[PDB]
């Protein structure tokens, strides 16, 4: 039952994410508003577009019952680009939240980093950080061939087994902390304090903002908690000398939820009330006389 709903999720996510990312990538064709706030959405769109380009390979992976055809030719690069795109996307969301907080609370902002050159520099830096953190996924993978299916998994058992018990613990814990814990924590500390903590309720606008903040937070949590929580729990129970039998059977559902979140981000973030009018698409003051 999980397989069918997961496959439907992948299909819907791809079908609604290719045009959703494509339309926002061009930013209404050629206006493109070369400003940091607008460039955030463009960079997020291109990252999610690369993610969606590499998604159908994982779609076949899930659909073919783990029958991944090619080895180092495909999965060795697929893993790297998947980590790069996913971590770039989550970093884009968290930097968008931080930027929104800083220009909404309105301190002296233009002096520190609110310049186009600084925007380009920080974009290059964050892309380099995403590449560096997706690095070891690229250069550490084996392709086992069992029961007429080839699985591209991690290869800690290969290379040098001289390593102690802590083999996958460091990388997974770093991914959980950096990639999930820091962005989710800072999004909470920003939004809940700004919105939920009833600070200056006089100007806490009850319009589309008050609902969109909550829907963004709820979508993010519901689509990112499954994958990280399941991975951490599974790794813990497997390394605690239990072998896990086959108890999850539904981990690709977490990936489908993440794909749905990546689908929803460009449509919900950019395609909004004002953008709806753009997507769908006086006089002169004179003078008269007066009796004295």
């Amino acid at each position: 039952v999980v397989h069918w709903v997961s496959l439907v999720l992948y299909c819907l996510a791809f079908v609604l994410g290719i045009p959703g990312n494509a339309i926002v990538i061009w930013f209404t064709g050629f206006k493109w508003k070369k400003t940091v706030t607008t460039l955030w959405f463009l960079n997020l769109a291109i990252a999610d577009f690369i993610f969606l380009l590499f998604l159908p390979l994982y779609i076949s992976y899930v659909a073919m019952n783990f029958h991944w055809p090619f080895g180092i030719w495909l999965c060795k690069a697929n893993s790297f680009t998947a980590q790069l795109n996913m971590f770039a996307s989550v970093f884009f969301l968290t930097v968008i939240s931080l930027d929104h907080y800083i220009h909404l609370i309105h301190p002296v902002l233009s002096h520190r980093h609110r310049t186009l050159k600084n925007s380009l520099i920080v974009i290059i830096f964050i892309w380099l950080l995403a590449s560096l953190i997706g690095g070891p996924a690229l250069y550490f993978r084996d392709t086992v061939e069992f029961n007429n299916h080839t699985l591209c998994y991690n290869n800690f058992q290969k290379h040098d087994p001289d390593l102690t018990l802590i083999r996958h613990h460091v990388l997974t814990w770093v991914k959980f902390i950096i990639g999930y814990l820091f962005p989710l924590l800072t999004m909470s500390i920003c939004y809940l304090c700004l919105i939920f903590k009833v600070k200056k309720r006089s100007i806490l606008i009850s319009s589309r903002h008050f609902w969109t903040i909550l829907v963004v937070v709820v979508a993010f949590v519901v689509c990112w908690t499954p994958y990280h929580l399941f991975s951490i729990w599974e790794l813990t129970i497997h390394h605690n000398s239990y072998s896990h039998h086959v108890m999850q059977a539904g981990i690709p559902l977490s990936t489908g939820l993440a794909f749905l979140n990546s689908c929803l981000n460009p449509i919900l973030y950019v395609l909004i009330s004002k953008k709806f009018q753009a997507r769908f698409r006086s006089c002169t003051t004179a003078s008269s006389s007066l009796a004295k």
């Binding site: 893993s79 086992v144 591209c152 996958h168 497997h238 072998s243 086959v246």
Partner: peptide, 11 residues
């Protein structure tokens, strides 16, 4: 035990 999760769920 023998690749029961196979340390594979995603990249």
């Amino acid at each position: 035990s023998f690749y029961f999760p196979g340390q594979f769920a995603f990249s």
